[PDB]
Design a protein around this ligand. Structure first.
Ligand SMILES: CO[C@@H](C(=O)N1CCC[C@H](C(N)=O)C1)c1cccnc1
Ligand SMILES: [Zn+2]
Length: 139
């Protein structure tokens, strides 16, 4: 679990969105595994606006933050899970690291701010849904 809190927005994995998220919906995209809902209180996270390929992510199944090198956002084939069939997920970045079911939502960040959140795992790989192109999160 986990979210990004920027401005009056909450960014979560679409597959983990709650009823309150759907009832206060701003934007959602199944192909990216992202959903954004509106919040009453202002958040403290800032979004990175950069081309970094190195950063640090939070892994809840280890209680640890790990430094990683990650690929540029791309269209990647992801295996069937309880939440989606096997399909192509867009705007996804991969790295080598631990990610098991429950780690979705952990933040990946670089020197400029939040880059994205954990969205996929297994086999010693972790995938992150990028948010750096969503410029509207800053206004
Ligand atoms: C977070 O890791 C899970 C994962 O990749 N999922 C399930 C949750 C939905 C993910 C997606 N974005 O399509 C895929 C996972 C699965 C299967 C095995 N190990 C780990
Ligand atoms: Zn950066």
């Amino acid at each position: 679990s986990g979210a990004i809190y920027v401005g009056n927005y909450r960014v979560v994995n679409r597959h983990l969105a709650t009823h309150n998220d759907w009832a206060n919906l701003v934007w959602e995209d199944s192909s990216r595994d992202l959903l954004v809902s509106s919040t009453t209180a202002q958040g403290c996270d800032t979004i990175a606006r950069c081309d970094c390929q190195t950063g640090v992510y939070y892994c809840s199944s280890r209680r640890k933050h790990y430094p990683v090198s990650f690929s540029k956002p791309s269209l990647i084939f992801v295996e069937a899970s309880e939440y989606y069939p096997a399909r192509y997920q867009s705007h996804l970045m991969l790295a080598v690291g631990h990610s098991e079911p429950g780690d979705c939502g952990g933040i990946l960040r670089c020197q400029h701010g939040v880059v994205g959140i954990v969205s996929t795992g297994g086999n010693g790989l972790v995938g992150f849904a990028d948010v750096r192109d969503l410029l509207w999160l800053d206004e």
